[PDB]
Design a protein around this ligand. Sequence first.
Ligand SMILES: CC(=O)N1c2ccc(-c3cc[nH]n3)cc2[C@H](Nc2ccccc2Cl)C[C@@H]1C
Ligand SMILES: CC(=O)N1c2ccc(-c3cc[nH]n3)cc2[C@H](Nc2ccccc2Cl)C[C@@H]1C
Lengths: 115, 109
Amino acid sequence: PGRVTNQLQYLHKVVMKALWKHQFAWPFRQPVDAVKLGLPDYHKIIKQPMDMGTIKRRLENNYYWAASECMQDFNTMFTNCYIYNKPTDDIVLMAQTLEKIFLQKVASMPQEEQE
Amino acid sequence: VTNQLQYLHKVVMKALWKHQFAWPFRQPVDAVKLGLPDYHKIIKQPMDMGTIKRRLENNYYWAASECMQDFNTMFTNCYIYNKPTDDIVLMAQTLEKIFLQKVASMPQE
Ligand SMILES: CC(=O)N1c2ccc(-c3cc[nH]n3)cc2[C@H](Nc2ccccc2Cl)C[C@@H]1C
Ligand SMILES: CC(=O)N1c2ccc(-c3cc[nH]n3)cc2[C@H](Nc2ccccc2Cl)C[C@@H]1C
């Protein structure tokens, strides 16, 4: 099903920890609530919702088999934001800022995955 | 030249450049050719694979994360500018997943 690996530990304790506490992270810590936000078209446009709270819970429950699977969920979270929102929305700039940190930290992840 | 930039050139760019969905991304967006008079009003930092490839060939980058940010900007511009239902968005998503899969095995500095 899933494993604990050196890389998944790094994504959890180093990458996710740094993104979670960021001042721009608050819109991303829980699923988009289309009802609360009054976005009745959100789920007609975005077919795979994702958020850091869901990723964090997956990391804690050993859901992922490999680091790449977790990285793809981070990517989906950011990509959903760019696809749905207007280019001028502040949330787009917040996602871009977080995504740059994600890439910087991923650049220093351990090279070979080990259980 | 670093270990990581060599990986980005020999593994990541090699895989992306020859991909069957790469052709819209191999040269800068030509807004005149494509009839997109608002492209440069929305997208303020254009980026494309031909530019990244030339920068790798020319030892332009000082750190691997700089190259990774250019890949990211190229994909993000596509998501921001295009309509969600445009095929180019699916093509970018496919290429970006390959990018992330390969970056998962990139060496450390
Ligand atoms: C991530 C994302 O895609 N979105 C999202 C998700 C959650 C929240 C949220 C959580 C708690 N309160 N509001 C807000 C937003 C964005 N709205 C927004 C963002 C920043 C400033 C002002 C606004 Cl209006 C819309 C968009 C659909
Ligand atoms: C990457 C990107 O953002 N775009 C882009 C860039 C270059 C090209 C291109 C190069 C040579 N010929 N066409 C086309 C496109 C997209 N168009 C498009 C893509 C696939 C199928 C049909 C169409 Cl209409 C629009 C969008 C603005």
